Design a protein around this nucleic acid. Structure first.
Lengths: 178, 142, 60, 67
RNA sequence: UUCGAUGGUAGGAUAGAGGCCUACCAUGGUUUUAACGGGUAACGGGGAAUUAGGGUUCGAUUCCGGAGAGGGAGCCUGAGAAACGGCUACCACAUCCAAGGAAGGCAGCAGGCGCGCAAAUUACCCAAUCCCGACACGGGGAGGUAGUGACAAGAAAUAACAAUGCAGGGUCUUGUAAUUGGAAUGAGUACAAUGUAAAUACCUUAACGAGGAACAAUUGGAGGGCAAGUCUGGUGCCAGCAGCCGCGGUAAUUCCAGCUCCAAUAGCGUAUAUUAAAGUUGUUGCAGUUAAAAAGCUCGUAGUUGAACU
């Protein structure tokens, strides 16, 4: 109305579309983590590039500068809270050495697969889509949920649905009828 | 060589302005030839009427019949030459079929061995190519 | 050419070629199953290797 | 979680006075309003502007001139 | 510079300075630092695209300022208009006419014709933002909501747990399944609560709702560029394919039919404009003996550059 609603693109197309040394790594990552497509890879590469660019623009200034000191912390707190960085060992230079592997292992899908109840990351994705997952206090219905270091302990099965009881029925009821 | 004085900005800007006209790309943009004398005034596609079919001959080293047609534009009045991509479509296409003409992909240049042809047909009778070919759509009874 | 045109001999091979019917095939998974099938046929179930061929559509 | 707003007027007169009409209809304190369509109302207003006076004089004059 | 072009005096007009206008007196003002004229498919800016940097292109369009309400011109009202959903006359159009006349302007909201490659309903409502008025109470095609789509951005249906022998692998695990079967099934179907001016939708509601047409994923390519066949059949420099190189004259990995594979994915290709690559516009940062390029040579004013020393 009065002002436009800002929208932006999150995925970036690589300059070389059919690099062998890049396609094999992307296919290996997709097969390992059960990603839908490579749009997730593009989006993660895009945000990582944004973080790296901000860190580089910060590091190109001298120390004890008010702007560099003020901005060199906020990225560190965000990374530590999101778990992208470790519980400790920060030096404002670890920001430039992140990987797509750790960014993708930081998603909620990796955590639910690691805890189990699916035997495979694809089944973990199926569980996360079926709304049967109880990640945190509020149910989450997205594999790309970046999970912090505080919501990894509330994950278990749902009270409702056949996996939690509550008169399953459905296919069970059909088999009982037949 | 080139001026390098601290107060030579005007000289450098003027020389660049004069020399940029020698650029083929800059000349083709700034002359306005697309809207002045080009068959297409910047339009991607244009409708027209088939005039006749011409059997152009391929240049060296190839040798074949290109199966081209001549189409008169309805919005400009300029008679141009058209290229039919597939085979066996010149029989389907008759005179006064309300064809649609577009570029060839060489930025207005002749593509391949076809001599003096810069446009290609995309739709016939307002139904589109490759649709009547696979017997999905049929030509209207006009 | 010059002032001539071959409007009668066009599409000779397309008109005279024999026409066959497509071979019947049951349904095939599409999507993440297709990605898993490609992953499963790439390296975990190697059958075409040795010499670096990595052939996926061998000729017969 | 289910969140909403609550506006207690701690009185009946205050609630019945300071309240939107659709809110009053939702509580169902009084009967709704049955009127003509918006287009019909606007057209009737236009005809009323075209006619100057009470309105029956035009009918009287038309009857006099046509009978 | 006539018929105001530059300046002075005096006056007129304006709400007000002012050659805005008038009478007289002087010939002045700009310009190679590009005056003036012409073109602009030029409303300007905040801004947008590409992004080492420098740059290049675009910007009618959600915000600000200017202009217009078919082209001009004049005028009343009003503080405020040279107003057009105010008026008047001409120019080009349209209309009822009884032939005396009358009467208008959607580059506003909807809808129609035509130009077209190219772009939506003759819908609901003042409930939210605000505006107007005599004013809690009225109105507002401003504005909010919805119907329509292939595309403008963000999230994700087309699956999956085992028994099974073979290829196996090293007693733990993948694949071809004319195989089964009990599972979690969501798209829809209905209904309830919520949502909203009324709704639609979202969220949410028990419950019905797959055993294979389950409720069949497509778009391009498979010589190099650039990833994936010298496979089987038809033609034989013909049809044609083809962004360039290039393939085709009876063994066609490049023509058309089948099989399979490769890339993206509910999206893909094509045509055009533009950007990066373009160190092929080069201030950064080009090149000039032979690839394009040192005036035949000299003087010379703008312009550029200008020894050291306080």
């Amino acid at each position: 109305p009065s002002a436009p609603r800002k929208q932006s693109k999150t995925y970036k197309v690589p300059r070389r579309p059919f690099e062998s040394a890049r396609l094999d790594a992307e296919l290996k990552l997709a097969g390992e983590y059960g990603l839908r497509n490579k749009h997730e890879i593009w989006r993660v590469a895009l945000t990582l590039s944004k973080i790296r660019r901000a860190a580089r623009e910060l590091l190109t200034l001298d120390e004890k500068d008010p702007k560099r000191l003020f901005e060199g912390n906020a990225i560190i707190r965000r990374l530590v809270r999101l778990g992208i960085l470790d519980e400790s060992r920060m030096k404002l230079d670890y920001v430039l050495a992140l990987r797509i592997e750790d960014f993708l292992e930081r998603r909620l899908q990796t955590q639910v697969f690691k805890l189990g109840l699916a035997k495979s990351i694809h089944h973990a994705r199926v569980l996360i889509f079926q709304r049967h997952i109880r990640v945190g206090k509020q149910i989450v219905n997205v594999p790309s949920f970046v999970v912090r270091l505080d919501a990894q302990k509330h994950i278990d099965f749902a009270l409702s649905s056949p996996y939690g009881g509550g008169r399953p029925g459905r296919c069970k009821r059909k088999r009982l009828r037949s | 060589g080139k001026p390098a004085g601290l107060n030579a900005a005007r000289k450098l800007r003027n020389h660049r302005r004069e020399e940029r006209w020698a650029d083929a790309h800059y000349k083709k943009r700034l002359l306005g030839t697309a809207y002045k004398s080009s068959p297409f005034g910047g339009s991607s596609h244009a409708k027209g009427i088939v005039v006749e079919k011409i059997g152009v001959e391929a240049k060296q080293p190839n040798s074949a019949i290109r199966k081209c047609v001549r189409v008169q534009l309805i919005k400009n009045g300029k008679k141009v030459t058209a290229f039919v991509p597939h085979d066996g479509c010149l029989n389907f296409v008759d005179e006064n079929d309300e064809v649609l003409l577009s570029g060839f992909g060489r930025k207005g240049k002749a593509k391949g061995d076809i001599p003096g042809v810069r446009f290609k047909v995309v739709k016939v009778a307002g139904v589109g190519l490759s649709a009547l070919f696979h017997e999905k759509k049929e030509k209207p009874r006009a | 050419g010059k002032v001539h045109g071959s409007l009668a001999r066009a599409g000779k091979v397309k008109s005279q070629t024999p026409k066959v019917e497509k071979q019947e095939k049951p349904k095939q998974p599409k999507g993440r199953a297709y990605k898993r099938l490609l992953y499963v046929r790439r390296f975990v179930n190697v059958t075409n290797m040795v010499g670096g061929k990595r052939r996926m559509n061998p000729s017969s | 979680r289910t969140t909403g707003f609550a506006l207690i007027y701690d009185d009946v007169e205050a609630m019945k006075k300071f309240e939107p009409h659709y809110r009053l209809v939702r509580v169902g304190h009084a009967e709704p309003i049955q009127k003509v369509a918006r287009q019909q109302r606007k057209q009737r207003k236009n005809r009323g502007k075209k006619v100057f006076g009470t309105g029956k004089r035009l009918a009287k004059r038309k009857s006099k001139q046509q009978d």
